[PDB]
Paper text:
To characterize the mechanism of AzaU inhibition of [name], we crystallized V. angustum [name]-C in the absence of ligands (apo), in the presence of ATP, and in the presence of AzaU. All three protein structures are highly similar (rms deviation < 0.5 Å). Rather than forming closed rings, V. angustum [name] monomers in the crystals form continuous helical arrays with six subunits per turn. We also observed the same helical arrays of [name] monomers in crystal structures of the V. angustum C domain alone ([name]-C), either as the apo-protein, with ATP bound, or with the inhibitor AzaU bound (discussed below). Indeed, the monomer–monomer interfaces observed in our [name]-RC and [name]-C structures are similar to those observed in NtrC1 and other AAA+ proteins that crystallize in closed-ring arrangements.
Here, we use X-ray crystallography to study [name], the central quorum sensing regulator in Vibrio cholerae and related bacteria. [name] belongs to the subfamily of AAA+ ATPases known as bacterial enhancer-binding proteins (bEBPs). In [name], as in NtrC proteins, the phosphorylation of an aspartate located within the R-domain activates the C domain for ATP hydrolysis and the opening/activation of σ54-dependent promoters. Here, we present crystal structures and in vitro and in vivo functional studies of [name] that together reveal what is, to our knowledge, an entirely novel mechanism of AAA+ protein regulation, in which a regulatory segment of the protein prevents substrate ATP binding and hydrolysis by occupying a portion of the enzyme active site.
Residue numbers in the entry: 141 to 392
The structure:
Amino acid sequence: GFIGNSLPMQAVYRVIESAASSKATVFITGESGTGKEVCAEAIHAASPRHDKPFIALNCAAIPKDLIESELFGHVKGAFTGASTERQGAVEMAHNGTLMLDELCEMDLDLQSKLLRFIQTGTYQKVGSSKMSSVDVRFVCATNRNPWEEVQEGRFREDLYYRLHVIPISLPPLRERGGDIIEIAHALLGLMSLEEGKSFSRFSEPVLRLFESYSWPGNVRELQNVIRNIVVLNTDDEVKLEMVPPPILEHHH
């Protein structure tokens, strides 16, 4: 779902294609705002299991005490809030690909249960001792340095080495050559549809700025900038005075 054919992305695409035909676990890293879920979905789409579900569990978007419920499910009444019985992400992903995003947010207890599941395919819903099993291909991602999480004792060493089979390090936006403006154009069209506008081009100073700024927030930051411009202005062309702070100030 990536856009562009910059040199560093070509290397990513080659690994995606080769990894897609394997069940080996992929472990994605990259700076804040790089496309970890885009990469995970692209692996699924290129894989023989592309017609089965792709499911992404963002471990940070969930209270830490509820990751286990979201991952493995829960029976009714398993904990005070368990209003009904819930199907886990592992069941939704059976025969497909499960992305464990922001994996280092799991507590050490859940990491132990996860490692068991990865080894065997067997799990239990929260609140039950009954075993079930599924078949998932795992893709993991983190914005931490996973080796550092291990050295600091926040992430299990056995789990790290079980999962870290096919690492993919995503190129930061600033290193992606022509991809920056290709992505920016796609976002310009999409945000224009969202907002009822009709932006179609960037002026040459805007092109130069977007192609020189360091984009510390990567593609998320570019999405914010394009959304800002389309929400706050009405024109066919993005002009330099429309670019929000502190892009220009920081750039200098």
